[PDB]
Amino acid sequence: RPFKQRRSFADRCKEVQQIRDQHPSKIPVIIERYKGEKQLPVLDKTKFLVPDHVNMSELVKIIRRRLQLNPTQAFFLLVNQHSMVSVSTPIADIYEQEKDEDGFLYMVYASQETF
């Protein structure tokens, strides 16, 4: 079940508030497998605390490693449906632009881009 179906909006806000206090320099990220996805396995976990200086292009490589893929297997990590592969922007900056109203930054991964 998606993260948002599992935790109320209030409980998500509280969780981000706590992460601000316990890990002030990490961006709180939710990474989830696209609903239709067939080729790629599910990640071992959903919630990621990412140091705010990490480039989005590095995050892409990190999640790919976590999936233990070959360099044959296509992988896309998307933020509000934008692929992050070429994005050298620090996650701190994407966070400020794209954070959910609950304070989490949501991402979705897939073996294809839709358009």
Characterise this structure.
This protein has a single domain, classed as Ubiquitin-like (UB roll) (Roll). The protein is built from 4 helices and 5 strands; from the N terminus they run H-H-E-E-H-E-E-H-E. Strands 2-1-5-3-4 form a 5-stranded mixed sheet. The two termini are 25 Å apart. It comes from Homo sapiens. It is found in: Cytoplasmic vesicle, Autophagosome membrane; Endomembrane system; Cytoplasm, Cytoskeleton. Pfam families: ATG8 (PF02991). GO terms for molecular function: microtubule binding; phosphatidylethanolamine binding; phospholipid binding; ubiquitin protein ligase binding.
Outline the biggest β-sheet. 5 strands, mixed
> What is the count of distinct domains?
1
Series of H and E elements: HHEEHEEHE
Q: Just give the CATH class.
A: Alpha Beta
Residues in helix, %: 25-40%
Distance between the termini: 25 Å
Shape: globular
> Helix count, per DSSP?
4
- What is the count of β-strands? 5
| Named CATH architecture | Roll
GO molecular function: microtubule binding; phosphatidylethanolamine binding; phospholipid binding; ubiquitin protein ligase binding
Subcellular location: Cytoplasmic vesicle, Autophagosome membrane; Endomembrane system; Cytoplasm, Cytoskeleton
InterPro entries: Atg8-like (IPR004241), Ubiquitin-like_domsf (IPR029071)
Protein name: Microtubule-associated protein 1 light chain 3 alpha
